[PDB]
Design a protein around this ligand. Structure first.
Ligand SMILES: Nc1nc2c(ncn2[C@@H]2O[C@H](COP(=O)(O)OP(=O)(O)NP(=O)(O)O)[C@@H](O)[C@H]2O)c(=O)[nH]1
Ligand SMILES: *[C@H](CC(=O)OC(C)C)n1cnc(-c2cc(OC)cc(C(F)(F)F)c2)n1
Ligand SMILES: [Mg+2]
Lengths: 1010, 206, 123
């Protein structure tokens, strides 16, 4: 409607209309809310709206209106303060100060408009950051004096001081120059004596809760930086650990203050200070025991009930106890009069560790790791904690989370999907339980065997109980002696089988199956020494591969390969009492074993066989095993190759396409585990495989021509491209592991390039496989140095056409993007001569492509782009004083300098700062080391490149950042060039520049910080 | 029974995609930066009745920040979002938290690490600790795979209603109606287009 | 919940899409269990589908005999069909749906069940 009128500034501002626009935004909805929002944004962003700020704060009926007005002032103070004439600066100051005093003295405004007062306090702090103490030396003394005139003013002054400390000490690193932060830190440090005096007196005499809470909230911030003497040479620790722990209004903030007190490393030679550190802990634990909860209390229940602030308090208690004890528990471990305090604090932690809260459990678990690792090494300590550790063993065992390997889940015992939050937690639990087992292996075995005895009984049978126990049992593998482990493992399995027999129903069955599979897969040392059992296990895994339950099936395959990775040797030798190596038995029945598996599980099976086969180091025997393993896919391959040459229409059948893809996938799986040993099988299919690659390629092109680009979405063409992708993956997989690189070059490479390069170049973009680039990257990486002409061929076939795919936006063809710059990186690193052979027009596109990578926010591309630029510079520098290097610098030195400066300063590429700074330092150092032997300019004759570089950069920055003074730019560049050998200082100067360009009037002496 | 929820975090962390997933069920693949704020109502059905969130989805890009902390006034809860594939977005979490709690001193806040579906994770689980001292709840999430996508709202609803046993429940499913040959000759225009527009993510499990 | 007066004839996990005719894009509407429910009183069969964790309805409409399942150019495990009266979001809207399944066999079984339900509703 008529809301836009406030945007017209030739008017007088209709405060009533502004308040209606504001009310419509905050309390409205729908389209009218959306319209008011856009209007308010335009109002706030108007460069003169701040001149309306006083009138809004005087005449408005809406607190949100005043808030927005203060945001307009904040934006002015933060960015354009020093452009104002001095009278406007004094006017804004007096006006903000006056409004704060005004709101404080009206008791009903003080109670009802907390946000608006908080926003005003922050606004005042922004003025202090610009004006204090140089142009406001009396702020702190007057603040202290005014604190006695009113309790409201005293409380609000604590808020101002809290915000001031935060802005100076907690959030200055990214927001101020190094010099300005140092100046404000020194200013606050110089005046803190008086500040602490006011703070301690307020805490000591104690007014009412609100003033105390605000004073403690300010103290929490001071503790981040103030000298230790203020805490230990006063009586404040006794106030914090007694008086302020008793009242729940101050308990939360005081516990956080004491946590910060605890996270200092005291001068640990002073007996007096050690006594005080003990004392405030003793006091605090006494207050909790008497005023909150005794150590026997059920904190799990309390947390779950979530009354009032109980969850936050228990979180804060855990942080306090873990912080203090990780630093200071040694202070409590020798004095016998402190033993009760030490163990009571850990007993609270035991109770806190039973809470059902994932993130809190991780906090306590981090502490337990800290403790048990120390008990594992430090002499004479573990006996102190014997009872704590015993309880902890029980807590961990009962709260084990599901490991990666266990693929069966309750929803209904089903088969997941999925993640790593749980994976990291399992690993952290295992770490602590392993330590705990070493600390007392008898106690651990007794807890686990007793728990397992009660699953037999049915005393405590449940899916949850057999799962966590089985997972804990598997997780401690390697902690016991081989003999105890033997007895331990035997008992566990026999009993787990006692649960299967006594369980009925498949739901129950797939649970105990996953548990047995996890345990056995975790104890390969046992399996290696007991062949007859290992054989029985594998046979049973094979049975599981025929299971109707889908989860059991997948885990059997994963367990099979997990065991084989560790016990492979026992499958390759002929065992006693056996007629042949077990690998021969496995290969023979591979068709019957894998009949009910999905294809990708079949391929895992073949990969597991490849692991075993590679343990045979006799070449003739290994190649024969390899030949036997591939019998089924090779037979299918020969059949499908014979009925593909004649009648090239046969691949129209989608069922044929699936068969081919599965054949290649099987070869990929075996090549993954066999690596260099796979060569004889690759050679068996290589030439016909590349002919198939060409044939499928013609089919794809034919479909796109007959059906349009939409053909690439159809199941048929997607299946054909899977063939090409798996062929490329197979060749990439082998070459990445090949040991005979002569064979790679003479046998594999040239037929490969003939089959893939022109086909990629001459397909429409939507039909090009990014996997071609990935395969070529590996080819260049491994044998690039031996095929200089082949690398040139690669560039000619993929460079310009892929670049044209990805240089219109940052989003299309994301995989081509990533592989493209991976390929350029390796060519530039390993076959730089291929770029020297490029025509000048194409080399310019290469420079264009590198800078294009700079501007990506995708880290995959950005990082490689910055790395290529750095390597390219080094490649050029390595050439020395030759025509190509001279021409490169004349054509491209300043392009790289300015492009790097652009992404450094544009606020859209912060993730690359470190590598951008490295590149810029290298470029600058090239000039100030006189490594560029020709003039960079086209300015008088004889001028050094150092002089021209400074003039170029000064002009560049003057035009790009016209609000900077000439002295700012000159001082920045002088410091930056001085520092081009010291990356850390260099980067600090760049950071200072990024601060200064966001405001007006930055001090040029800031760049002398170093 | 409605509550104001402000959603903040660096640009590109997935704030808008996360809300859209809860609004319509879709996954928006494109990045269209939010300008200032977008307000959407969002209702969940629980065993304690319906709960309505007025979700203020704010802009993460500084040049599009609009009213910035002006959007936080009278928020009753919040979600702080970052991207586990971008360390800078986690490094900025304390800055978003600072500005938020200066306006909203005592509200429940969830910290969400989004995009855990991406293989090359960069902000490791072990390094995510900022929530501990600040009493924020934390979740790994993925708007793309829906991993834990319901957990932030479920936790906030339990805190705002004050019932730890609150659960999402199935809404009542009314009987659907029994229901044009005037345009039936033209609902092959609209249908053939749909038939010949391929479905997205055909390689997914569903 | 409004589901006790009904019998479950068929259940399958699926991902449901809706066609944005303006933007020319398919948009996901929900993933979860798709159920064919036969009303005990009227014998009419409807599709009812809820999202996995929020349990929110993403499909609720009669399996009309007028409807026809069509293939999508990009999938061998999906069906496209027009719907004139779906009340998952509120007031009965018309939609062009696509529903995709875990496998071609699930899509084929769904089509068989979808057509057996159309017969039931033609009484
Ligand atoms: N792989 C993946 N991508 C996601 C996920 N969530 C969002 N994205 C993607 O991240 C990009 C950013 O989208 P968006 O939701 O607008 O983020 P935003 O924080 O709201 N942007 P802004 O704050 O500037 O308005 C999109 O391309 C989106 O597809 C996710 O969970 N996984
Ligand atoms: C219980 C689960 C089960 O039987 O699943 C079937 C498929 C329904 N159960 C019974 N027997 C085992 C068992 C026996 C083994 O003998 C050594 C080995 C295993 C294995 F897990 F190690 F493979 C399992 N499990
Ligand atoms: Mg957004």
């Amino acid at each position: 409607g008529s809301m836009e009128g406030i945007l017209d500034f030739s008017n007088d501002l209709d405060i009533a209309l502004l308040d209606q626009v504001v009310s419509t935004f905050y309390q409205g909805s729908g389209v009218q809310q959306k319209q008011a929002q856009e209007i308010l944004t335009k109002f706030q962003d108007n460069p003169d709206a701040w001149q309306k700020a006083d009138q809004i704060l005087q005449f408005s009926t809406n607190p949100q209106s005043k808030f927005i007005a203060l945001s307009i002032l904040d934006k002015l103070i933060t960015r354009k303060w020093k452009l104002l004439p001095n009278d406007h600066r004094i006017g804004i100051r007096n006006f903000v100060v006056g409004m704060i005093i005004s709101m404080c003295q009206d008791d009903e405004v003080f109670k009802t408009q907390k946000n608006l007062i908080n926003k005003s306090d922050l606004t005042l702090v922004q003025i202090l950051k610009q004006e204090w103490p140089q142009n406001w030396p009396e702020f702190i003394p007057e603040l202290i004096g005014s604190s006695s005139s009113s309790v409201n003013v005293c409380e609000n002054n604590m808020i101002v001081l809290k915000l001031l400390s935060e802005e100076v000490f907690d959030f200055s690193a990214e927001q101020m120059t190094q010099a300005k932060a140092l100046h404000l830190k020194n200013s606050m440090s110089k005046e803190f004596e008086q500040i602490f005096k006011l703070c301690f007196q307020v805490l000591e005499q104690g007014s009412s809760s609100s003033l105390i809470v605000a004073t403690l909230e300010s103290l929490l911030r001071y503790l981040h930086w103030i000298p230790y003497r203020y805490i230990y040479e006063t009586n404040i620790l006794e106030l914090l650990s007694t008086k302020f722990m008793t009242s729940p209004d101050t308990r939360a903030i005081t516990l956080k203050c004491l946590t910060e007190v605890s996270n200092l490393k005291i001068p640990q030679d002073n007996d007096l200070i050690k006594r005080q550190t003990v004392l405030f802990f003793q006091n605090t634990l006494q207050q909790i025991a008497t005023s909150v909860m005794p150590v026997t209390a059920d904190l799990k229940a309390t947390y779950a009930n979530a009354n009032g602030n109980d969850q936050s308090f228990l979180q804060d208690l855990a942080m306090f106890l873990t912080t203090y004890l990780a630093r200071n528990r040694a202070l409590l471990e020798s004095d016998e009069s402190l033993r009760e305090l030490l163990l009571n604090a850990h007993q609270y932690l035991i109770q806190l560790s039973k809470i059902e809260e994932r993130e809190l459990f991780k906090t306590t678990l981090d502490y337990w790791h800290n403790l048990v690792a120390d008990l594992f090494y430090e002499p004479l300590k573990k006996h102190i904690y014997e009872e704590i550790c015993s309880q902890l063993r029980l807590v961990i065992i009962e709260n084990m989370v599901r490991p990666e390997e266990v693929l069966v889940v309750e929803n209904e015992i089903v088969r997941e999907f999925v993640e790593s939050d749980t994976i990291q937690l399992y690993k952290s639990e295992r770490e602590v339980l392993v330590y705990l087992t070493h600390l007392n292996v008898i106690d651990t075995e007794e807890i686990m065997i007793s728990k397992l005895a009660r699953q037999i009984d049915g005393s405590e049978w449940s899916w949850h109980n057999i799962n966590t126990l089985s997972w804990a049992i598997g997780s401690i593998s390697g902690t016991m002696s081989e003999d105890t482990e033997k007895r331990f493992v035997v008992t566990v399995i026999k009993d787990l089988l006692g649960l299967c027999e006594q369980k009925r129903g498949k739901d129950n069955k797939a649970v105990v199956a996953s548990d047995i599979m996890y345990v056995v897969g975790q104890y390969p040392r046992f399996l290696k020494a007991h062949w007859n059992f290992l054989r029985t296990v594998i046979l049973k895994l094979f049975k599981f591969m025929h299971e109707t339950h889908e989860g059991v099936q997948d885990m059997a395959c994963d367990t099979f390969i997990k065991i084989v990775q560790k016990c492979k040797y026992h499958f390759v030798i002929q065992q006693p009492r056996e007629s042949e190596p077990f690998i021969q038995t496995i290969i023979r029945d591979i068709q019957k074993t894998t009949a009910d598996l999905q294809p990708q599980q079949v391929h895992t099976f073949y990969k597991a066989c490849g692991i075993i086969i590679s343990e045979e180091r006799s070449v003739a025997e290994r190649n024969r095993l390899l030949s036997d393993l591939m019998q089924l896919p090779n037979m299918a391959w020969d059949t499908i190759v014979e009925q593909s040459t004649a009648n090239p229409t046969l691949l129209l059948d989608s069922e044929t396409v699936k068969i081919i893809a599965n054949i290649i996938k099987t070869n990929v799986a075996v090549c993954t585990s066999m690596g260099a040993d796979f060569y004889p099988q690759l050679g068996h299919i290589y030439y016909n495989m590349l002919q198939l690659y060409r044939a499928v390629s013609s089919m794809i092109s034919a479909q796109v021509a007959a059906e349009g680009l939409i053909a690439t979405k159809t199941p048929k063409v997607r299946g054909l491209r899977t063939i090409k992708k798996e062929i490329l993956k197979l060749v990439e997989t082998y070459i990445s592991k090949a040991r005979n690189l002569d064979d790679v070059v003479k046998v594999l490479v040239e037929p490969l390039l003939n089959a893939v390069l022109e086909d990629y170049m001459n397909n429409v973009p939507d039909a090009r496989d990014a996997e071609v680039l990935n395969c070529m990257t590996t080819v260049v990486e491994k044998v690039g140095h031996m095929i200089p002409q082949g690398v040139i061929l690669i560039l000619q076939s993929v460079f310009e056409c892929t670049l044209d795919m990805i240089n219109k936006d940052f989003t299309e063809y994301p995989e081509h993007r990533v592989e493209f710059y991976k390929l350029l990186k390796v060519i530039n690193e390993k076959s730089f001569a291929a770029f020297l052979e490029l025509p000048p027009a194409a080399f310019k596109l290469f420079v264009d492509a590198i800078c294009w990578a700079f501007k990506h926010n995708n880290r995959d591309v950005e990082v490689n782009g910055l790395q290529i630029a750095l390597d390219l510079v080094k490649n050029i520098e390595r050439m020395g004083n030759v025509p190509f290097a001279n021409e490169f610098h004349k054509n491209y030195f300043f392009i790289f300098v300015s492009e790097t400066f652009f992404v450094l300063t544009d606020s859209d590429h912060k993730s690359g700062f470190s590598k951008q700074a490295l590149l810029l330092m290298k470029l600058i150092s090239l000039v100030y080391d006189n490594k560029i032997s020709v003039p960079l300019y086209q300015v008088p004759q004889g001028t050094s490149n150092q002089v021209y570089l400074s003039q170029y950069l000064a002009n560049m920055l003057s035009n790009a950042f016209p609000h900077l003074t000439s002295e700012q730019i000159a001082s920045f560049l002088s410091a930056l060039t001085k520092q081009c050998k010291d990356l850390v200082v260099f980067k600090g100067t760049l950071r200072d520049f990024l601060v200064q360009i966001k405001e007006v009037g930055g001090d040029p002496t800031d760049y002398l910080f170093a | 029974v409605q509550f104001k929820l402000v959603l903040v975090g660096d640009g590109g962390t997935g704030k808008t995609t996360f809300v859209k997933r809860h609004l319509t069920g879709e996954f928006e693949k494109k990045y269209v930066a939010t300008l200032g704020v977008e307000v959407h109502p969002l209702v969940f059905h629980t065993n304690r009745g319906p709960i309505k969130f007025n979700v203020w989805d704010t802009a993460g890009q500084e040049k599009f920040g609009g009213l910035r902390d002006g959007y936080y006034i009278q928020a009753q809860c919040a979600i702080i979002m970052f991207d586990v594939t971008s360390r800078v977005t986690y490094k900025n979490v304390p800055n978003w938290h600072r500005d938020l709690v200066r306006v909203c001193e005592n509200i429940p806040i969830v910290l969400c690490g989004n995009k855990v579906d991406i293989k090359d994770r960069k902000v490791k689980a072990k390094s995510i600790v900022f929530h501990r001292k600040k009493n924020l709840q934390y979740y790994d999430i993925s708007a793309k795979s829906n991993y834990n996508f319901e957990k932030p709202f479920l936790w906030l609803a339990r805190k705002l209603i004050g019932d730890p046993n609150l659960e999402f429940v199935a809404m009542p499913a009314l009987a659907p109606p029994e229901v044009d040959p005037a345009l039936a000759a033209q609902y092959e225009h609209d249908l053939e287009v749909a038939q010949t527009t391929a479905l997205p993510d055909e390689d997914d499990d569903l | 919940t409004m589901e006790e007066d009904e019998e479950v004839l068929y259940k399958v996990r699926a991902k449901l899409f809706r066609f944005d005719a303006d933007a020319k894009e398919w948009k996901e509407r929900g993933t979860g269990d798709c159920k064919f429910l036969k009303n005990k009183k009227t014998n009419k069969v409807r599709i009812l589908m809820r999202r996995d964790k929020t349990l929110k309805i993403c499909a609720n409409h009669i399996i009309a005999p007028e409807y026809t399942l069509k293939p999508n150019v990009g999938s061998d495990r999906s069906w496209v069909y027009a719907c004139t009266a779906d009340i998952a979001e509120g007031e009965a809207e018309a939609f062009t749906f696509a529903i995709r399944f875990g496998s071609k066999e699930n899509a084929d079984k769904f089509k068989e069940e979808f057509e057996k339900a159309q017969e039931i509703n033609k009484k």
